[PDB]
Scaffold this active site. Sequence first.
Site, mmCIF file in Angstrom:
data_model
loop_
_atom_site.group_PDB
_atom_site.id
_atom_site.type_symbol
_atom_site.label_atom_id
_atom_site.label_comp_id
_atom_site.label_asym_id
_atom_site.label_seq_id
_atom_site.Cartn_x
_atom_site.Cartn_y
_atom_site.Cartn_z
ATOM 1 N N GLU A 1 97.388 -18.586 25.315
ATOM 2 C CA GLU A 1 98.777 -18.211 25.486
ATOM 3 C C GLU A 1 99.230 -18.580 26.890
ATOM 4 O O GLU A 1 100.141 -19.391 27.076
ATOM 5 C CB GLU A 1 98.941 -16.713 25.183
ATOM 6 N N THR B 1 102.838 -10.245 24.109
ATOM 7 C CA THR B 1 103.052 -11.609 23.638
ATOM 8 C C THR B 1 103.307 -11.715 22.140
ATOM 9 O O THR B 1 103.491 -12.823 21.630
ATOM 10 C CB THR B 1 101.873 -12.543 23.994
ATOM 11 N N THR B 2 103.340 -10.604 21.429
ATOM 12 C CA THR B 2 103.712 -10.478 20.050
ATOM 13 C C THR B 2 104.836 -9.427 19.956
ATOM 14 O O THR B 2 104.939 -8.580 20.830
ATOM 15 C CB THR B 2 102.587 -9.970 19.130
ATOM 16 N N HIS C 1 93.457 -14.712 20.948
ATOM 17 C CA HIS C 1 94.342 -15.712 20.384
ATOM 18 C C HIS C 1 93.639 -17.057 20.401
ATOM 19 O O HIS C 1 92.949 -17.333 21.383
ATOM 20 C CB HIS C 1 95.650 -15.776 21.154
ATOM 21 N N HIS D 1 92.302 -10.837 25.320
ATOM 22 C CA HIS D 1 93.205 -9.833 25.894
ATOM 23 C C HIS D 1 92.548 -8.473 25.832
ATOM 24 O O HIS D 1 92.323 -7.952 24.734
ATOM 25 C CB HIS D 1 94.530 -9.786 25.116
ATOM 26 N N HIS E 1 97.404 -10.555 12.154
ATOM 27 C CA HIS E 1 97.819 -11.381 13.282
ATOM 28 C C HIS E 1 96.638 -11.827 14.138
ATOM 29 O O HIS E 1 96.598 -12.934 14.700
ATOM 30 C CB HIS E 1 98.817 -10.659 14.219
ATOM 31 N N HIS F 1 91.439 -8.124 21.778
ATOM 32 C CA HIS F 1 91.645 -9.134 20.761
ATOM 33 C C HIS F 1 91.707 -10.523 21.409
ATOM 34 O O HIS F 1 91.720 -10.645 22.632
ATOM 35 C CB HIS F 1 92.919 -8.865 19.959
HETATM 36 C C1 LIG Z 1 106.686 0.409 20.188
HETATM 37 C C2 LIG Z 1 105.400 -0.156 19.605
HETATM 38 C C3 LIG Z 1 104.187 0.144 20.216
HETATM 39 C C4 LIG Z 1 103.002 -0.364 19.690
HETATM 40 C C5 LIG Z 1 103.038 -1.166 18.561
HETATM 41 S S1 LIG Z 1 101.554 -1.829 17.866
HETATM 42 O O1 LIG Z 1 101.930 -2.871 16.945
HETATM 43 O O2 LIG Z 1 100.742 -0.718 17.380
HETATM 44 N N1 LIG Z 1 100.912 -2.322 19.129
HETATM 45 C C6 LIG Z 1 100.989 -3.564 19.639
HETATM 46 O O3 LIG Z 1 101.787 -4.382 19.202
HETATM 47 N N2 LIG Z 1 100.120 -3.801 20.642
HETATM 48 C C7 LIG Z 1 99.961 -4.995 21.376
HETATM 49 C C8 LIG Z 1 100.701 -6.155 21.143
HETATM 50 C C9 LIG Z 1 100.494 -7.319 21.903
HETATM 51 C C10 LIG Z 1 99.529 -7.328 22.902
HETATM 52 S S2 LIG Z 1 99.141 -8.694 23.938
HETATM 53 N N3 LIG Z 1 98.927 -9.872 23.042
HETATM 54 O O4 LIG Z 1 100.319 -8.877 24.783
HETATM 55 O O5 LIG Z 1 97.897 -8.381 24.616
HETATM 56 C C11 LIG Z 1 98.772 -6.159 23.134
HETATM 57 C C12 LIG Z 1 98.987 -5.011 22.381
HETATM 58 C C13 LIG Z 1 104.255 -1.476 17.937
HETATM 59 C C14 LIG Z 1 105.442 -0.963 18.467
HETATM 60 ZN ZN LIG Z 2 97.144 -10.725 22.965
#
Ligand SMILES: Cc1ccc(S(=O)(=O)NC(=O)Nc2ccc(S(N)(=O)=O)cc2)cc1
Ligand SMILES: [Zn+2]
Length: 256
Positions: A103, A195-196, A93, A116, A61, A91
């Site tokens: 975003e 946001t994902t 986007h 981010h 991603h 990371h």
């Molecule tokens: C309940 C749960 C917890 C964590 C995960 S994960 O996939 O390991 N973590 C994860 O998605 N982290 C994450 C996602 C999006 C963003 S962001 N883009 O909002 O900064 C920043 C960070 C999946 C599911």
């Molecule tokens: Zn992000």
Amino acid sequence: HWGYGKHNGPEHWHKDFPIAKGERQSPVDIDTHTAKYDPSLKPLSVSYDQATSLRILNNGHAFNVEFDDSQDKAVLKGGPLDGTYRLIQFHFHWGSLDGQGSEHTVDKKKYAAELHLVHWNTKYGDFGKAVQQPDGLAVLGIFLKVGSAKPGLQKVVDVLDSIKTKGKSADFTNFDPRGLLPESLDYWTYPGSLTTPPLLECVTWIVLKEPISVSSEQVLKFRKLNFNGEGEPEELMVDNWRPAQPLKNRQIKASF
Ligand SMILES: Cc1ccc(S(=O)(=O)NC(=O)Nc2ccc(S(N)(=O)=O)cc2)cc1
Ligand SMILES: [Zn+2]
Ligand SMILES: Cc1ccc(S(=O)(=O)NC(=O)Nc2ccc(S(N)(=O)=O)cc2)cc1
């Protein structure tokens, strides 16, 4: 297999992640003329001098630069935050072209990319518990515009060909995320979500006003990454951004 294609992109996410249509989804458009200065906001403190970066991972991603978050090394405090938030990863986007990629938007303006830096509230012990709380996370958002190169970013750019495809990682020690900050820490803040997927509504967003500049050649290398795994048809990792979501019952506050 949510993603950013036409088949599995942001308009599809809600079928497996119903919170996508929630009351506090991110990102949002930041309407500067509606955002209000809040003199209640305490000074923002970004304390990254002892950060211990570990590794860089292409997760299919985006790519994440991961930190040791086993103690209070690199932390974010102040601003709208109560308590201490530990840096766990950062990371970006970004877009297929310079006219899109962020975003958050600012009076509907899209930047070329958005950084981010992700932090979790130490009162909850670990990231997984923190994403079960409405104040579990703080994400520091920084816009990228294309112009002059950002020297602090080059070490990231140069390791990307070693993590071109999904699931690849590389050692990434001794990286100082302070080289990715702009001069000014003026920000906007609002309560929001990841946001994902899973789109969990656990984030205090802090979006800096001042963008950083990166060069055309730097962001061009971002766009050489792949969403796919090794040996699969090549899908360039571009346009891995979610568009702005309804602001609903929220107020964006300005620190300046
Ligand atoms: C309940 C749960 C917890 C964590 C995960 S994960 O996939 O390991 N973590 C994860 O998605 N982290 C994450 C996602 C999006 C963003 S962001 N883009 O909002 O900064 C920043 C960070 C999946 C599911
Ligand atoms: Zn992000
Ligand atoms: C090999 C290794 C494992 C664990 C550590 S640590 O110091 O506990 N740090 C750590 O776990 N960091 C970390 C863990 C998960 C994530 S993630 N998967 O949400 O991007 C992001 C960052 C350090 C070294």
